[PDB]
Design goal:
108 residues; 28% helix; alpha+beta; binds manganese (II) ion; homodimer; globular; Beta Polymerase, domain 2
């Protein structure tokens, strides 16, 4: 998709104070954008994931996937053209997210 | 194709890598992801090295190799095929579900 869903996800995630928000242009890589951020506690991680869900249902966007919400260590919210990854500051795969997957200059 | 994949499966097999699983990334990424694990950091490195050794014999170019020293999660980018050698105790290895069609062997 475009910055419309991405900005939609960035804001939602921003309203809940998600830290280190990073977008990835998954463009040439996957079959568009991957939004990454993290919470400092399992309660904060779920708050973020929920605001994204709440906002997604307001704008009428179909959530294709949502996994790891209960555990709140690595919540994946598939919004289609955009996929959000909300990690817990202590999640290890969150620091190895380098191996996996080109960023996107949000402010622009 | 199965040429590089079988090449990687064998290398990883010579070192006794356990729970070898191939993933068809067709229609997902821009070929094959291969996963397996070692029971110790020494075994994990043995596997990663056999892959490196085999890759240099066949003359295939290793694009990436990360986490070898730590031997908790070694990534060997062989191009069309990317191998992930985990340590049986690595957590991201049990959450590899979230991330992302299992190829037969
Ligand atoms: Mn698209
Ligand atoms: Mn509507
Ligand atoms: Mn917990
Ligand atoms: Mn160690």
């Amino acid at each position: 998709s475009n910055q419309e869903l991405l900005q939609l996800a960035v804001n939602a995630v921003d309203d809940k104070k998600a830290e280190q928000v990073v977008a990835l242009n998954m463009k040439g890589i996957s079959l568009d954008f991957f939004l990454i951020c993290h919470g400092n506690s399992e309660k904060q991680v779920q708050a973020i994931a929920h605001e994204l869900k709440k906002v997604a249902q307001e704008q009428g966007i179909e959530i294709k996937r949502l996994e790891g919400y209960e555990q709140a260590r690595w919540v994946l919210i598939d919004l289609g053209d955009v996929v959000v990854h909300v990690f817990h500051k202590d999640e290890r795969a969150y620091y190895n997210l380098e191996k996996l997957w080109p960023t996107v200059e949000l402010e622009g």
